[PDB]
Design a protein around this ligand. Structure first.
Ligand SMILES: Cc1cc2nc3c(=O)[nH]c(=O)nc-3n(C[C@H](O)[C@H](O)[C@H](O)COP(=O)(O)OP(=O)(O)OC[C@H]3O[C@@H](n4cnc5c(N)ncnc54)[C@H](O)[C@@H]3O)c2cc1C
Ligand code: HEM
Ligand code: HEM
Ligand code: HEM
Ligand code: HEM
Ligand SMILES: C/C(=C\C(=O)O)C(=O)O
Ligand code: NA
Length: 568
């Protein structure tokens, strides 16, 4: 057979997958996927049959309930979503090579016929608030608006939930939490504010940073109340004290937070629509929001009538063409991002009259795995790892800000460096076991052996770690002035991860005020239009602190949902 449906219909009728009339149920293909599961079992049951030692197409780190049609189309060959970041050895029936080529909002102007017919029709739904994007900000907004009495529709253009938020590793910043106090950490919102402003080169809007710092504990409390574990508190670059909250043992914050938010949305019966892209904010004759035109992948164009639209669409760091026009120094770099993070939400915001700000400030994460492409968390450094160059020497304060760390690594021989750590660091941060599983953390029982394996001078490496451990014992890094020296690298085996910078986060975006209301270039509010999360500008300035994005998206998402509900 040339496709999956052709395979099946050899022994099955059309209505084995389809409704009685043949019509597709909805853009989430809810009915159709229910039929796949009726025969094959749930994703977990299918996973039992597709185990490899270190990976499984049907058992990944993605949170939520991943629809079968995310990867298996019926009447055409289809792509394995995992191939957008990894190259695992897969043999999916009817596969084709991964290629993302999504039309821009501008290109969709060519559907003039189709869009006019939709806008001339009745609204498919009439609700209070539409939230665009199923990352942390969007789920938080949908939940908070729902708890404030609003009827919400939440849309996601991708086949899977969670955006980049589901990938978050190192943690969620907050002060001064019960969780911090339980670990004998002393902090304050004021200190978080000061670190954030300094870290951003004082470009940040201080009113927005005040919301970030002052709301941070409440946001940790809100997540915890919904069932999250934010009890482990680690150090990140550019922080005065440990304030990056994450699950017990140092697991990834993102997949966890997104799973909690998903479960909470499901509990509240929030109307979540996948494969549904927000295209155009609709305004009335006085310039207030009246709804949104969307494009369903399977069902086509339609509009939703609503008082408020919350754009929670994330950043543009995957779009290297757009990135390179704003910061040419990042041209041709790899990205940490999900394949959809291309800035179409900003285009929607600008078309609706929203102004952008701080667009030129784009963060490279200093440590992507050369071997695997993926982000290696800053928490590896925060929990004690060092960086060495090919000459086997330290060359930078490993917990400085990301601008400086990225520059330092790019200045080294080969434009890459190596994270070096031991089993004490490994045992302190369970996320590290994920890199070992990915195959990007080669190991040996001596640094001479590890050095030989990886092309690092083994004698120099050995002496470097001995020297570093001596600085840890004496309490002061006189070589690079690293201010936090949590562990000696002296237990068990040693590990190396080759790392280099990659495009990660876009600090600029739509201009909002402290109530998450979108403003035009004259700083006039667009009534009914809100923005929250990485789609916004002004929170992070010229350089975002590690841990501050998850803080942002929960705080501003929740605020936007409450404000939108009140407005409606
Ligand atoms: C690998 C990785 C690890 C990270 N780790 C951390 C960490 O530990 N701590 C931290 O603070 N930050 C971290 N960050 C940064 C942080 O996770 C991102 O800033 C965060 O994902 C922003 O959340 P968001 O809700 O604004 O957007 P996202 O989570 O990106 O979600 C936006 C969603 O909207 C969608 N969307 C876009 N346009 C449309 C449209 N037109 N219609 C419908 N849907 C649309 C998407 O496809 C996406 O699903 C990390 C980022 C990455 C990539
Ligand atoms: C049986 C011969 C059969 C028919 C007939 C049929 C029709 C059909 C159409 C016309 C569409 C497109 C509808 C639209 O509004 O665009 C469509 C799409 C999907 N189908 Fe189908 N289909 C038949 C068979 C089957 C079988 C056996 C399955 C499940 C294995 C199946 C499933 C799907 C799914 C999923 C879609 C969405 C698009 C896609 O994934 O290709 N169909 N079908
Ligand atoms: C729903 C859209 C759906 C999916 C997805 C799906 C997947 C799937 C694959 C990838 C195969 C292997 C095909 C190949 O080897 O080339 C496969 C095969 C079988 N399926 Fe299936 N399937 C979906 C829908 C359904 C439904 C609704 C049924 C039952 C009515 C069904 C059953 C089967 C059977 C039987 C096979 C052959 C292998 C087996 O498990 O016996 N599928 N399907
Ligand atoms: C949803 C629950 C779902 C079903 C059903 C399904 C079916 C399915 C079958 C039957 C196979 C063949 C297994 C076999 O050889 O016996 C198969 C294989 C792969 N699939 Fe699948 N699949 C479902 C979900 C998904 C999703 C969401 C993805 C992509 C993230 C995906 C992908 C794959 C891949 C890849 C394979 C090949 C696996 C391998 O190890 O080579 N499936 N699926
Ligand atoms: C697609 C559904 C998919 C699969 C399957 C998958 C697997 C996978 C494995 C096996 C690892 C190693 C650690 C583990 O066992 O969980 C791993 C690690 C990372 N992945 Fe992944 N991954 C899938 C999809 C994607 C996509 C599309 C991206 C990029 C947007 C991505 C990213 C990452 C990152 C980052 C890691 C590092 C470890 C971590 O952060 O937990 N994955 N993945
Ligand atoms: C903490 C972060 C990423 C990571 O884990 O290194 C981030 O805030 O982007
Ligand atoms: Na931004």
């Amino acid at each position: 057979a040339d496709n999956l449906a052709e395979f099946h219909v050899q022994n099955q009728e059309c209505d084995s997958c389809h409704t009685p009339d043949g019509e597709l149920s909805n853009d989430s293909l809810t009915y159709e996927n229910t039929q796949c599961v009726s025969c094959h079992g749930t994703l977990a049951e299918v996973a039992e049959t597709t185990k490899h030692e270190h990976y499984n197409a049907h058992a990944s780190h993605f949170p939520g309930e991943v629809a079968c049609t995310s990867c298996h189309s019926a009447h055409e060959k289809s792509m394995v979503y995992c191939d957008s970041c990894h190259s695992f050895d897969f043999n999916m029936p009817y596969a084709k090579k991964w290629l993302r080529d999504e039309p821009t909002i501008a290109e969709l102007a060519k559907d003039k016929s189709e869009r006019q017919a939709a806008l001339a029709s009745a609204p498919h739904d009439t609700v209070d608030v539409v939230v665009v994007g199923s990352g942390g900000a969007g789920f938080s907004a949908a939940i908070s608006a729902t708890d404030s009495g609003a009827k919400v529709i939440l849309i996601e253009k991708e086949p899977v939930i969670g955006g980049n938020a589901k990938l978050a590793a190192g943690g969620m910043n907050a002060a001064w939490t019960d969780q911090q106090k339980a670990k004998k950490i002393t902090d304050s919102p004021e200190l978080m504010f000061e670190d954030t402003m300094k870290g951003g080169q004082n470009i940040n809007d201080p009113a927005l940073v005040k919301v970030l710092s002052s709301h941070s504990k409440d946001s940790v409390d809100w997540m915890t109340a919904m069932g999250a574990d934010l009890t482990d508190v680690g150090m990140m670059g550019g922080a005065s004290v440990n304030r990056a909250h994450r699950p017990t043992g140092g697991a990834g914050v993102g997949a966890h937070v997104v799973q909690v938010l998903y479960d909470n949305a499901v509990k509240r019966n929030i109307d979540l629509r996948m494969n549904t892209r927000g295209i155009e904010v609709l305004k009335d004759d006085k310039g207030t929001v009246k709804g949104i035109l969307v494009k369903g992948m399977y069902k086509g164009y339609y509009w939703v009538k609503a008082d408020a639209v919350i754009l929670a669409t994330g950043g543009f760091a995957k779009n290297n063409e757009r990135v390179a026009k704003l910061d040419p120094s990042l041209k041709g770099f790899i990205s940490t991002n999900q394949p959809g993070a291309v800035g179409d939400g900003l285009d929607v915001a600008e078309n609706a009259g929203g102004a952008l700000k701080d667009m030129q400030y784009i963060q490279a994460h200093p440590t992507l795995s050369v071997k695997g492409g993926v982000m290696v968390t800053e928490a590896v450094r925060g929990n004690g790892a060092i960086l060495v160059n090919r000459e086997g020497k330290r060359f930078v304060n490993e917990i400085t800000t990301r601008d400086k760390a990225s520059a330092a690594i790019l200045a080294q021989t080969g434009k890459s460096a190596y994270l070096i750590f031991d089993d004490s660091v490994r045992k302190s941060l369970s996320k590290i076991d994920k890199y070992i599983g990915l195959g990007v953390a080669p190991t040996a029982d001596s640094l001479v052996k590890l050095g030989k394996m990886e092309g690092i001078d083994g004698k120099a490496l050995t002496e470097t770690v001995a020297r570093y451990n001596s600085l840890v014992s004496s309490g002061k890094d006189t070589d690079f002035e690293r201010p936090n020296l949590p562990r000696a690298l002296n237990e068990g085996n040693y590990y190396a991860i080759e790392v280099t910078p990659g495009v990660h986060h876009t600090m600029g975006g739509v201009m909002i005020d402290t109530k998450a209301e979108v403003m035009n270039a004259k700083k006039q509010v667009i009534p009914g239009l809100y923005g929250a999360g990485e789609v916004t500008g002004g929170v992070h300035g010229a350089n975002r602190l590690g841990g501050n994005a998850i803080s942002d998206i929960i705080t501003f998402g929740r605020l936007a949902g409450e404000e939108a509900a009140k407005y409606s």
